[PDB]
Write a protein that binds this DNA or RNA. Structure first.
Lengths: 126, 154, 203, 80, 96, 98
RNA sequence: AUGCUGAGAACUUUCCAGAGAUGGAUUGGUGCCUUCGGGAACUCAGACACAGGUGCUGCAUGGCCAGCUCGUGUCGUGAGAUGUUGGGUUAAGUCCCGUAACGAGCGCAACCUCCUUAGUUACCAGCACCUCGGGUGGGCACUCUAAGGAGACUGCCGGUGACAAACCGGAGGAAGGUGUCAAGUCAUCAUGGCCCUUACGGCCAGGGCUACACACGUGCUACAAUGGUCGGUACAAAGGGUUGCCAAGCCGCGAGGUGGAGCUAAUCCCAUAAAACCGAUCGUAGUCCGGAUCGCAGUCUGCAACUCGACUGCGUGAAGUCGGAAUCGCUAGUAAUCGUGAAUCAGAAUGUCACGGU
């Protein structure tokens, strides 16, 4: 069927999309997007691929992804919009290079260095 | 000496529909909270026109008229007096001084509504009678004694 | 920073493979000291390269990888109980002692470093002999031996890093192995530590 | 800390020339071999000298004392 | 079955002698349940002069495995308790 | 020094010399079940009964060297051993990773 | 650390001159190998010798940005030089082509997304159930933090350049070009010219190391207005854990000593918490942020809190107003304000804090 497995990841996650076709319905983390979130702007940043792939009338999206911070896996809703849909078809394949929202940025907080203050935040010298 | 960086502007605003305004959460983010920033990123733009009669993208765009300079203030040596460099420059220089210093006069007002003491200066550029407009006309007539120094001894 | 702490795994083996529990981790760490201090001052004859100390079923395990059995072994176990008693009475657990065969022993580094302190104290020459330490141990087998000599060399104010190198010995990589035999002893004047960097073949 | 979780002071070996010396008159100073050693709250008005190694100090004790160490008659660091 | 073993290389070679030698005797023993790397960072000093800018990294691993026997009668857990060590492996056993 | 490394090392058998009166006198003090007359009976405990019965003057060191700093809970040894132990292989499981 | 000789082997030496060790009344014991000879460890002990350097001494006694040297060959009378210059390039002694030079070692460069089998005891993507916190089968596919792994390109076409190192541009695809500076330790292993030599072989040691009289290596914290005082939010939560970590606390405004769910921890003790909504009366202050000697005094280590300690309850006693003389120093994951749990088995180890969600 359309009973698939996609995964968005920010801060070492393992996600669950219970995806099916429909008409533009969004939900996240056993909640709605108007239910867990609100008092932010990061909800409809994901609108930017969503309205340009014209899937606002075709799919039902429920990407549970947990962990991180307040607006940290608000950076994971960035990723998991088209992963479990390009495993269906190949229409929007080359039409998503303009956005560029899949690469898990490895410029996060890596290994801990002594002598410095943080990863590569340098201390006071003379 | 090679320029290795690649200019990557990322502009996609969730509700506001701007063109050049979207990613500006950098000095509105005062190393703190985003939920504190929610009435002052766009909620203050929903607070500029509430005493006015327009759309808040009307007045924001026209900051590239009279608080943007004409010549540049970088210092250069030949063998004598250190000459600055007046020239007609591309918009990335003069309009860089038309957005970030317009908000930089926000502490000597100190009024009610933290959301209003950031964006209570933007509507003053309809005639251009605010705070950043005084220093832009200082630039042009402190460039009379320099304007011939572009090829000869520059 | 140490290179020899990296290859604990996919190339060589630990010599202390034993376990007690997380609060019990330092009970058999009491017995891991006094065994090596008896081979340094006393059993210089049939010198020792590597010592494996393990805790098998119900007693202990110490294997002494020497070179000469004819000085130790005599007439079917006359000194086997003499190593079994003089060691394991300060050691917490007793040791059944096996003896293996390391025929052609000129390719361990400790089997060369613990043979030069017996040669430098009685005024045997300091320049012709460190050449001939690796002129006659390089017929078959190894391809190169470096010996960094930064030390005494007759004169008391010397920081001359000597250049007794013969072959090709890279000492930075892990597949090309690094040997490190830093024995130290007291010559007639001046503290001299015998350092040996024999390079065998890789893999 | 240092509250009155410890109410009394029943110390036996710091005692046997103190509690017995009530019936005997007060003509000799009770010498002390510590910077710690204390005595009863019902004997109030004895003399204890600060014990460290060279010379002794004037020690004056009145009726109203409840709190802490003997470190005030001679100081901790007595300003040499 | 729970053990108390060292690392990656002395339980992944110690459970190979357990499950196949317990499947030979007509019994059913389940498969290996994983356990990742025991993350703990260690910091000491290495400089001959006293120096605060010089620290480093170390670790001791601790890896155990969850197993269970469905029909408990196995001599693989008691007689092959002395086999499943080589040098310092201490095989705890559980009758599960 | 010779009259120092063998006079405080003997605290293994002198601090717990008694070792049976030292536990029969230090648990029910943490119980409020003692009566109002019984503030004194539990205080004939350990001091003039010669005063090597507390433990405020013992320190943890190395064995072969005797260095008190650099001592951890996972060893009986110190900071000048770890660089020179597991490369000769005196410590199990100490392996470099990330 | 000592060689010779000891009654009693060793213990007990708790108790008394100790306000402060023990010598000893030492409250009892004869032990120990049996040619029934002999032998040996110790609380202290009387002789001879010493161990201790705890002053001195890094000067005949430390070894773990990028260029420097050897060997061979040459030119030069020689020291010395060529190699390593130059021309085009490089994070680079990185190279390409030239070039009486040719090969070397060292620094540099490199070395430290794909998966069978997976979840005895978490819990709900299969689902009944649930207090919809999942008691539990089932969670191996619509998974719970992976041991170890094809891993990331001079790979390719095209315009420059001698075509050549590179340098500019395009792939795919919500991933594509990275051997140095007469100085701190004869002292954590070492090692000298003189020394204490009834002695730093004796130790229970009869206390006398901060007059404020300054510059400062200065280096979180604010500029009183986002305005002056809390017990509240979708909410941290596991390991070491057989002399340990120390429940909901009955105690509480805030003290979770008797209690103890966890005693070998998909358990938990600090177990409570995240800078959000519109937070109150009143709407812009050297002051209703302000307490430096006068917390006295409150059943927790337990023989050792007689004019001094956490417990911040805010009745009081202030100096924080655009950083200017001039300079710490910021070109990309950066300039940048949420904390550490655990011993030789007793828990106040602060400028470089396991995650700064910006």
């Amino acid at each position: 069927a359309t009973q698939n497995y996609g995964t968005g990841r920010r801060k070492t996650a393992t996600a669950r999309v219970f995806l099916r076709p429909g008409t533009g319905k969004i939900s996240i983390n056993n909640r709605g997007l108007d239910q867990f979130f609100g008092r932010e702007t990061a909800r409809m940043v994901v609108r930017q691929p969503l309205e340009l792939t014209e899937t606002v009338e075709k799919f039902d999206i429920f990407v549970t992804v947990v962990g991180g911070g307040v607006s940290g896996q608000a950076g994971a809703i960035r990723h998991g919009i088209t992963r479990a849909l390009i495993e269906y078809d190949e229409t929007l394949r080359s039409s998503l290079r303009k956005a560029g929202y899949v690469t898990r940025d490895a410029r996060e907080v890596e290994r801990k260095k002594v002598g410095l203050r943080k990863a590569r935040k340098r201390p006071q010298y003379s | 000496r090679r320029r290795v960086a690649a200019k990557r502007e990322v502009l996609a605003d969730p509700k506001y529909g701007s063109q050049i305004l979207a990613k500006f959460m950098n000095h509105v983010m005062e190393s703190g909270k985003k939920a504190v920033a929610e009435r002052i990123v766009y909620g203050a733009l929903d607070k500029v026109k509430e005493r006015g009669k327009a759309d808040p993208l009307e007045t924001f765009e026209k900051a590239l008229d009279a608080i943007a300079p004409l010549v540049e203030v970088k210092s250069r040596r030949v063998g004598g007096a250190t000459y600055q460099v007046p020239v007609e420059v591309r918009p990335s220089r003069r309009n860089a001084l038309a957005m970030r210093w317009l908000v930089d006069f926000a502490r000597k007002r100190g009024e009610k509504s933290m959301a209003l003491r950031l964006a209570g200066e933007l509507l003053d550029a309809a005639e251009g009678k605010g705070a950043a407009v005084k220093k832009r006309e200082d630039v042009h007539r402190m460039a009379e004694a320099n304007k011939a120094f572009s090829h000869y001894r520059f | 920073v140490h290179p020899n702490g990296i290859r604990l795994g996919i190339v060589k083996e630990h010599t202390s493979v034993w376990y007690a529990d997380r609060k019990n981790y330092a009970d058999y760490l009491f017995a891991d000291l006094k065994v090596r201090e008896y081979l340094q001052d006393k059993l210089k004859s049939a010198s020792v390269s590597r010592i494996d100390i393990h805790r098998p079923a119900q007693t202990a395990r110490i294997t002494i990888h020497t070179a000469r059995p004819g000085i130790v072994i005599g007439k079917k176990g006359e000194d086997v109980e003499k190593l079994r008693q003089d060691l394991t009475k300060q050691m917490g657990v007793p040791v059944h002692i096996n003896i293996e065969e390391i025929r052609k022993p000129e390719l361990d580094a400790m089997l060369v470093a613990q043979s030069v302190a017996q040669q430098l104290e009685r005024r045997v020459m300091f320049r012709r002999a460190m050449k001939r330490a690796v002129q006659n141990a390089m017929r078959i087998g190894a391809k190169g031996i470096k010996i960094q000599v930064s030390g005494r060399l007759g004169g008391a104010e010397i920081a001359r890093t000597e250049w007794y190198r013969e072959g090709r010995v890279p000492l930075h990589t892990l597949r090309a192995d690094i040997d490190y035999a830093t024995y130290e002893a007291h010559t007639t004047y001046g503290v001299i530590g015998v350092k040996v960097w024999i390079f065998k073949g890789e893999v | 800390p240092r509250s009155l979780k410890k109410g009394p002071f029943i110390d036996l070996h710091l005692l046997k020339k103190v509690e017995v010396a009530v019936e005997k008159n007060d003509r000799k100073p009770i010498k002390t071999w510590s910077r710690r050693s204390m005595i009863l709250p019902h004997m109030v008005g004895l003399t204890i000298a600060v014990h460290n190694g060279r010379q002794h100090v004037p020690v004056l004790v009145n009726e109203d004392m409840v709190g802490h160490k003997l470190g005030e008659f001679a100081a901790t660091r007595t300003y040499r | 079955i729970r053990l108390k073993a060292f690392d990656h290389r002395l339980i992944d070679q110690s459970t190979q002698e357990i499950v196949e030698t317990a499947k030979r005797t007509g019994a059913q023993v389940r498969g290996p349940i994983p356990l990742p790397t025991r993350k703990e960072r260690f910091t000491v000093l290495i400089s001959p002069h006293v120096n605060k800018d010089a620290r480093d990294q170390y670790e001791i691993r601790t890896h155990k495995r969850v197993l269970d026997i469905v029909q408990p009668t196995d001599k693989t857990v008691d007689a092959l308790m002395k086999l499943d060590l080589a040098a310092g492996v201490e095989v705890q056993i559980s009758l599960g | 020094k010779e009259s120092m490394k063998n006079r405080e090392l003997k605290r293994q058998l002198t601090v717990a010399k008694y070792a049976k009166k030292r536990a029969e006198l230090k648990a029910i003090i943490a119980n409020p079940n003692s009566s109002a007359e019984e503030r004194w009976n539990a205080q004939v405990a350990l001091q003039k009964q010669p005063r090597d019965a507390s433990a405020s003057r013992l320190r943890n060191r190395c064995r072969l060297t005797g260095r008190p700093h650099g001592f951890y809970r996972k060893f009986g040894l110190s900071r000048n051993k770890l660089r020179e132990a597991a490369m000769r292989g005196d410590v199990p499981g100490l392996v470099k990773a990330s």
